[PDB]
Amino acid sequence: TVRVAINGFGRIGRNVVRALYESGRRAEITVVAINELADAAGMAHLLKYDTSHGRFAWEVRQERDQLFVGDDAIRVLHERSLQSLPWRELGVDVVLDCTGVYGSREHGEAHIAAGAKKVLFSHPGSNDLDATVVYGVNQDQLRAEHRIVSNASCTTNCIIPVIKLLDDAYGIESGTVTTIHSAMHPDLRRTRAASQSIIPVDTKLAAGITRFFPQFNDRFEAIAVRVPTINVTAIDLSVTVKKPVKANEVNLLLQKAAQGAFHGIVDYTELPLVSVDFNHDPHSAIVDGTQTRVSGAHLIKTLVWCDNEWGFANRMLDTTLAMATVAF
Amino acid sequence: TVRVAINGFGRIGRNVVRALYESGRRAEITVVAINELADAAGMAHLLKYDTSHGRFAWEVRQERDQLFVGDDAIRVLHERSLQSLPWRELGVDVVLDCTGVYGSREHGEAHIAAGAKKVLFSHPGSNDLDATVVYGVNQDQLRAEHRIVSNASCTTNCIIPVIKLLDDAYGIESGTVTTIHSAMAYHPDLRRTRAASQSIIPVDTKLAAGITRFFPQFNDRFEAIAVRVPTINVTAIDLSVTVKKPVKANEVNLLLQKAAQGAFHGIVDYTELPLVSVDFNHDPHSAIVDGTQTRVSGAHLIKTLVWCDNEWGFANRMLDTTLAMATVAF
Amino acid sequence: TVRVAINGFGRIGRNVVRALYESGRRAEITVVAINELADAAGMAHLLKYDTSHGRFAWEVRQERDQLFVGDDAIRVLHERSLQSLPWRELGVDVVLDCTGVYGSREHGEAHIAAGAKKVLFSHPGSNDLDATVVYGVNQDQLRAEHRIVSNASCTTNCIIPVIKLLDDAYGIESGTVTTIHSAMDLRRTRAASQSIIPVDTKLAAGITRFFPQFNDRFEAIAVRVPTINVTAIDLSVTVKKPVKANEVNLLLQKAAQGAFHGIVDYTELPLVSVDFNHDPHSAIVDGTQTRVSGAHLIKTLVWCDNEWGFANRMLDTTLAMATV
Amino acid sequence: TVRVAINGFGRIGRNVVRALYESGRRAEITVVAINELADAAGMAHLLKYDTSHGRFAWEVRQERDQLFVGDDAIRVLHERSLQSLPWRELGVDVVLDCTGVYGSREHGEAHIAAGAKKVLFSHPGSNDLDATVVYGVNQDQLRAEHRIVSNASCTTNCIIPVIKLLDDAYGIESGTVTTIHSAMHHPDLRRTRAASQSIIPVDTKLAAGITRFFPQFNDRFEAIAVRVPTINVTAIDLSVTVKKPVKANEVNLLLQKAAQGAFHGIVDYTELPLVSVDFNHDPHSAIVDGTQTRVSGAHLIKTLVWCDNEWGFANRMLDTTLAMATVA
């Protein structure tokens, strides 16, 4: 088994754990430790009861510095100092660092100093790492020597595979995206009741895209709003393409990719569905074919769904396996 | 005083009335009659309470066959045949048809035959009316012989003025729009039965065909989708267009900002404040450009996010259009 | 195997099918037919996709006037009159009439006449049926010759067991209830405002019908709030015997452990309404909220997934009816 | 004119100012000064824009240390030290302290020593202030010798007048209350959980507040509360046992009459079929919903009570303020 440690037990951290068990990936991966600067009581409770995902099916037990999920024992640490973590003693193959705040070499190297073989960040970090993976797109670029890696971000994993598919088919020359987020300072917007408004929020989506697709620097922008719905995101993508195209052809391309090389990663639907119907859906992206439009023959719009959190947590596990099982 | 009658007292009919008093337009226009099918105890209560900006500030009551707003008496009518509406007896200058159902030349003629000089429809109607007005964009296209006019639609009015501004400055080549609508058993459209509170729900939208009617040149160059989210009374419109001329986000904002100071004052507003949607609740502008959200990808793909209280701006535009029709008039 | 047909494929009828498969009761009940006025594609669709209960696990296909759940075929009918339902041909043991509109003795008689052996109504219905069952409280009042039975109402089901527990231990003198409803006609014409909306409720009438000694001693009100489909029931009773709040919690905790296990649950954990979504208990007593004013006025807060709990009790009462 | 200063410009302090301008009380009360740590530009923006109460009808400008409401200039302070507040300079007759921090006899003494003649706190406070006033019920218990006064709390202000009314008519023996809060505000494990889906139990000091005010109901009153995702209007579900025998129509008639007479402008009564937003920005402390009144047997009364907790409370602060500067 690949022995994994979770640094930080916020929403992504807890989701990685549930997804490990629910997906059957536990036959190949085991979680041996979680570091979180909060009490084990609350951790265990929040792991068992989720608003967005419901009741977790495995017995959850907490005792001393141990968290139990079914039979598995899991050490709970409260360390402010990354180098003082017991990674070597626990035989840590991969630390999944889910703390948020940027990722980087210094931090990865501190997990490695404590004795972890590799590090996978949940957040894009800086342009300094051994690699950034959008699983389903570029995991075959990983090498045995890539030890400090980033899995991109919740929102980037949703849209990148779609962008890849459209650009391969038609050549993207320009792109603009709006993300409609579900519910989840020097900004007079935070101190406003989320219950009733469409609230614009900061987004780093564009940076994510142009870092992954450097041929689009100065060619991509993004905005975002928050709305009071349940954990499903809609990404509204508008791209100009080189080759002329019609909507039913954009749709055929995406249907077949979901059928084929992107099965499990990008799904496609034509059914009359609403966002909750993708709650807890493990795909990175579900293209809603009913919303595909082409203006003229060069301006594509697609509406893409994702459970950004559940999709991403599953990909985190996919990337962890790819990292842990590569030959030099 | 411009004599008006309102046919249909649903959300829009009621908002037209509220707008008339709140805006001061009542110095210019008097509502002589309201035609509504369905009890009138309702009418008063809904006028009073279903408002969204506090209880309507004018005193409201229902006596006899009459509705009282403040000290004004309005004749309440219940008539199913357009032919027998007593517009002639009341000397009605414009009938504001707010039913959401009547929209054809023949419906127009039917109102005019019962004695209205002119008719204004609260929705796009048929493709062959005398004119379709987006107040602030093309009221000047109203001739004297145009007795049957459409006011376009709530959503259409939000966006066409920004489209005009953008087209004139940079030349729109193609365009795509997403409307984020606020909230309003078994049904053949399967999405409609679903709990609204929980979801982003894709909805059918007529916006593209509205843009297309107004801008003949944009046929086959414009598309639209929409979703409904569980927020209240303010719509956002997410507009992406390719333009001929090379532009930056800052120049697009200056343009729109200057236009809001000048020729679209009172119609299109502009802002750079960190505001949220409820901040435009009961705002009477047709559109509010949110400067902070403006992007240009490359130098030719503009994204603008526009807000509106779709019902409130529309109701106000109905009154504005009324006066212009009355202005140069048959 | 009990052969059941379902009349009305509204939310209730659909949860009855979902629950049938999820609890494993496929082993003792078979659904042989559904009558629904609307078309079978709509039915299959709604069965699969649900805002409250997520994606249904079993494969759902629709094919002509057949509906397929897993390997199972279910005839779909569109009869608007009870007399023409093919209950004889299909050998129906129990109609589960979930329409919310057929509830009288003569509606039961028309189901029987068409060949159904018995009928279980998914609502209080007529006041002159053979029995009204709130499972866990009075299924032992059931008899073989009871042919036209009512299953009470979802909200009645949530609270009646708790009322019985409290009346037995301390003697209820008077009672008053507020139901806080989720996404479940004077005020409907309003616009969207995200409001607490008062709604008419029949809970007082359901409580006194089940406990007639409470006539003129019980009242209830309700509000709708824009939440997910878990109801909170806020029950305030005056009682004869003096009590403290911790005594009340012990009694219900023990009730949950014992005679009401699987019907009433009990929690002292810091939960919120979504934590009871898809819970098949009729009621979950929240101990953290129990209060006693003085020593005689008890307040209890009780949670329920009113739809889910109720659809499972319908199944229980069904089995109890068929293999008597 | 009574000169007043406001200490703390959060939600309550801003609402007092809005309430002042909207009620016409600007003829009797002048706000000479606001002390607030945050920036003036922020104060102005938040005074102008508010999700509950909407766009302030009065112009709002901010320049330097001045906040302009209409054409009234108001002095802004940023002083952490009560001893240094320039009250004497400004001739402050009453400090409305709306910080929700300050609340003790000493804090009161500090304001007075800095030169404010009297003090009104916007909350419970501590158990030894000169008076606690729920305006409409006990403003008669005010004496000129009362210098350090508390206004009670929002919810306590909504329900006390009703309890008074029912106790006076019928003799209340015992009481229990559930408060249905909208989106407003031992580690509470529920506070993580997203407001947008659930009914969420929350701690309440309502009973404490009632006990404090009516110590004869010591051991005779309890309260729970929940939060639901509605906008700014609270429902209070009050269930009391009474000594006298009563009927629901008699209860409603009592309360309707009190609303016509002795509690006019403080308690309102309605028989109309309404919803909670209908009371948004309603200045009464309480609106009894007559459609919802019940009595079980002849002694167990339920009434459902609405209030815009923040707006009624803002208006009461001013009522008390006015009763504190005039004892002549």
Curated annotation (Swiss-Prot), chain A:
Entry superkingdom: Bacteria
Pathway terms, separated by semicolons: Cofactor biosynthesis; pyridoxine 5'-phosphate biosynthesis; pyridoxine 5'-phosphate from D-erythrose 4-phosphate: step 1/5
Entry's Gene Ontology cellular component terms: cytosol
Residue sites binding NAD(+) per the record: 11-12, 80, 308
Keyword tags: Cytoplasm, NAD, Oxidoreductase, Pyridoxine biosynthesis
Disulfide bridge positions per record: none
UniProt site (Activates thiol group during catalysis): 181
Sample GO molecular function, one term: NAD binding
Assembly information from the UniProt record: Homotetramer.
Name of this chain's protein: D-erythrose-4-phosphate dehydrogenase
Swiss-Prot record, chain C:
SUPFAM superfamilies membership: Glyceraldehyde-3-phosphate dehydrogenase-like, C-terminal domain, NAD(P)-binding Rossmann-fold domains
HAMAP family: E4P_dehydrog
Protein name in UniProt: D-erythrose-4-phosphate dehydrogenase
Binding-site residues for substrate, renumbered to this chain: 153-155, 188, 201-202, 224
Pfam families, A to Z: Gp_dh_C, Gp_dh_N
UniProt site positions, description: Activates thiol group during catalysis: 181
Any GO BP annotation: pyridoxal phosphate biosynthetic process
Subcellular location: Cytoplasm
Enzyme class: oxidoreductase
Impact when changing residue 154 to A/G/V: No significant activity
Biophysicochemical property: temperature dependence: Optimum temperature is 50 degrees Celsius at pH 8.6. Relatively thermostable. Activity begins to decrease significantly when E4PDH is incubated at 50 degrees Celsius for 5 minutes.
EC number: 1.2.1.72
Similarity annotation: Belongs to the glyceraldehyde-3-phosphate dehydrogenase family. Epd subfamily.
